[PDB]
Amino acid sequence: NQIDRLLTIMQRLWDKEQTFATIAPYTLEETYEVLDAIAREDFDDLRGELGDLLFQVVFYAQMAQEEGRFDFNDICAAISDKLERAQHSALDDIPRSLPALMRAQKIQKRCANVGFDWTTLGPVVDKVYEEIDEVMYEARQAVVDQAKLEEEMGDLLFATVNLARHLGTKAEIALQKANEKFERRFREVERIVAARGLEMTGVDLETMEEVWQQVARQEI
Amino acid sequence: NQIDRLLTIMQRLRDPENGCPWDKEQTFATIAPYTLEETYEVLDAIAREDFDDLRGELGDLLFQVVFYAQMAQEEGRFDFNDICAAISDKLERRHPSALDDIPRSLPALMRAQKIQKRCANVGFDWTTLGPVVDKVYEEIDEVMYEARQAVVDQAKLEEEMGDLLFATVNLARHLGTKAEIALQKANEKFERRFREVERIVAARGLEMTDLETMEEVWQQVARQE
Ligand SMILES: Nc1ncnc2c1ncn2[C@H]1O[C@H](COP(=O)(O)OP(=O)(O)OP(=O)(O)O)[C@@H](O)[C@H]1O
């Protein structure tokens, strides 16, 4: 009955109102922990990780209520009532669920098959560039247009994947393995800190950067 | 308050008893996907802007949060309600190694930002935009090195392109956006767009009898929207 402390908590709470996006990618990573926990069978987590997941949805309950759209009990209206009871296209059956990079590469393959690709390397590359241009361009406006930045940050990732394809590599992996090499070195580095006894907030960035250097020229 | 009519049907549905085939046959390890799928529809709407779908949809999600809460409480771990009071207790009290415990599951984009926000909170990070960006550049160049040899070393090649990607998340963030999200959006805009060309190219009589046309209608759509 908490369920209510909780409604009466979402009415009432950065904080900020804000928005529905930025709201989104909080949900997303949240669902990701839920799933993480189930695979670890980690069950005490599971109880927080779903507080969390459930936290969001009270927002959407929230913000929705604030418009003609009718609020939380209503939410649990639809879903209730159900349980007692396009054209063409090369892009079909790409689950939405797929992660970003891989769903980008996947799309580009489709276009490729259907005859719609760059057909040499050069303008593939040309273009990562053109797009980095449009990104930095945006970024240094005296007043930034948040959207157009993000938009441009987009086009650049789709751009560079497209390069991953022409080189024949799979972008979602590559970067997986970059958090692998990265994750690796970095802990190498947390550890030779602690070997000194000093802390990791017991450093200056010079020391970090220079150990990190020690570290990577330690594979030859 | 319908919530209650909900918490139930769950009773009467995961019911020992009556029903059922098929809602009664679910572990956690298997609800898990439709939580993903739904989370994924739940943003489709708040990017499509679709307020009918979005009740209907949120509910199918609420519902998971409950589905777990039933099952949790069949093994007697906790009740939908304990779930409220975990958060209820843990919002309210805001009022009035740091790569441990970053998942794997998690997309490249999200986990490089995350890993990255992570070394940042122990200030391991770049201090100024300029040479974030530079290092992209630098890494691109690494890529083309790899990319041009008389004999390409495919392995090498992948790695250095790993890092191009990382670099570029290093930037997207720092430019204070979220890469995986920025990709999602771009992906959508594109997919929208081709789509159209495609419905343009069909309309287009028949052929039967390109490609620019192909590359042209594309740009002529670029403007159109
Ligand atoms: N096969 C292709 N041929 C031509 N262009 C392509 C191809 N694949 C991707 N592109 C890129 O070219 C298009 C134009 O790039 P751009 O970054 O200018 O986006 P835009 O919407 O046209 O303009 P802006 O980026 O300024 O909004 C994008 O849709 C992007 O996909």
Ligand SMILES: [Mg+2]
């Ligand atoms: Mg662009």
